[PDB]
Amino acid sequence: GHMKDLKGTKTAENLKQGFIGESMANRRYLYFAKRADEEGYPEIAGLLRSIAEGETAHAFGHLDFIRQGGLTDPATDKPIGTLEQMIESAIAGETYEWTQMYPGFAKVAREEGFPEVAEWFETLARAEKSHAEKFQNVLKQLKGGT
Amino acid sequence: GHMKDLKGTKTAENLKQGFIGESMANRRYLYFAKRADEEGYPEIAGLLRSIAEGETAHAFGHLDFIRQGGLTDPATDKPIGTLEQMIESAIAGETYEWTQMYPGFAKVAREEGFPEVAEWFETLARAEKSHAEKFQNVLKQLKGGT
Ligand SMILES: [Cl-]
Ligand SMILES: [Cl-]
Ligand SMILES: [Mn+2]
Ligand SMILES: [Mn+2]
Ligand SMILES: [Mn+2]
Ligand SMILES: [Mn+2]
């Protein structure tokens, strides 16, 4: 029982990268499943969806080791030990997306001659602003307010 | 109607990074929802799950622009225009994970004194090998075989 700290280790970075790849895999497989669905391949669609559940299990297990080891959220570098911390992590990521990421992407898309992509990024910025506000309302309630 | 190619643009990289962040957000929010569930916060859990659906919509829309613009899969740098290409992308990512990513992570985890994390990475390598084989079997069927 020689217990070591994950902070600042390569393993900590590897758990974060594992989480990213697992997250992408579930999204990709469910996206692919819709193409199988369209074209009439229910067994392929079903396999994609079942393997996607595996990737959920993998992502969540990475997060368990991250949280239990006192590492931060891969997306935000904020702690995710408690429910309030998790909501704070949500708010930080949403805030980054609507105040920095998506408006910057929309500006670049317009500069590069991709106005339809820019309008999408603008739509998303508005959506993440909404998400942030709604998470802020839950945080206020968790902290004992209205 | 002055149509430009997304390949090699900043916008192409921004769609990929958008996809990564959206993927992580859906995973994180569903993970957070389970903590809300445990502790008896059904309205918070429900909000997390509903916002997670938004993040699905966002991720899938990024993939639509990627695919429609002839860009490759953020996770594998493989085309994802057709169902067979999507399955090939799945196989490539699974193959990377079991033949390189997870065994390398397990080796590093053991070196750094994290055997329980290593055993997890070893479990995952075995799982991704299984996923690869099962996707390879579907690809063989899509190509007209048994
Ligand atoms: Cl089928
Ligand atoms: Cl509640
Ligand atoms: Mn996996
Ligand atoms: Mn959001
Ligand atoms: Mn989003
Ligand atoms: Mn897999």
Residue A3 DSSP SS3: coil
In our burial notation (b when 16+ CB lie closer than 10 A, e otherwise), range A58-73 reads bbbbbbebbbebebbb
Could you tell me if A109 lies within 8 Å of chain B, comparing CB atoms? yes
Q: Do A60 and B27 touch (CB under 8 A)?
A: yes
Contact B75 A24 (CB under 8 A): yes
Element (H, E) at A47: helix A42-68
Please check whether residue B139 touches A, CB under 8 A: no
- With residues binned 3-state (H G I as helix, E B as strand, rest as coil), the percentages for chain A, rounded to 5, are 80, 0, 20
d(CA A73, CA A80): 6
Among all bound ligands, the one having the nearest atom to the CA of B43 is 2
Q: What is the DSSP letter of A71?
A: P
Residue of chain B whose Cα is closest to the Cα of A61 = B120
Euclidean distance between CA atoms A28 and A25, whole angstroms: 5
Q: Cβ–Cβ contacts within 10 Å for residue A115, how many?
A: 12
Cα–ligand 6 centroid distance for B126 (angstroms): 9
Going by C-alpha positions, the residue among A105, A104, A44, A75 that lies closest to residue B62 is A105
Size of interface A-B (CB pairs under 8 A): 193
Residue among A140, A54, A60 nearest B35 (CA): A60
CA of A34 to the centre of ligand 3 (A): 20
Residue A112 Cα to ligand 1 midpoint, Å, equals 41
Residue of A nearest to B127 (CA): A54
Query: How many Cβ atoms sit within 10 Å of the Cβ of residue A26?
Result: 26
Q: How far is the CA of B51 from the centre of ligand 4 (A)?
A: 7
Q: Can you read off the two tokens belonging to residue B116? A: 């329980």
Task: Provide CB contacts within 8 A for B85, sequence distance 6+.
Answer: B78, B79
8 A C-beta contact, residue A128 and residue B51: no
Say if residues B10 and A112 touch (Cβ distance below 8 Å): yes
For residue B3, the Cα-to-chain-centroid distance in whole angstroms is 30
Q: Which ligand is nearest to the CA of A33?
A: 1
Length of chain A, please?
A: 146
Please state, in angstroms and rounded to a whole number, the distance separating the CA atoms of residues A26 and A50: 10
In angstroms, this model's resolution equals 1.1
Q: Which of B53, B33, B52 is nearest to B44 (CA)?
A: B33
Q: Return the C-alpha torsion angle B122, B98, B105, B111, nearest 10.
A: 60
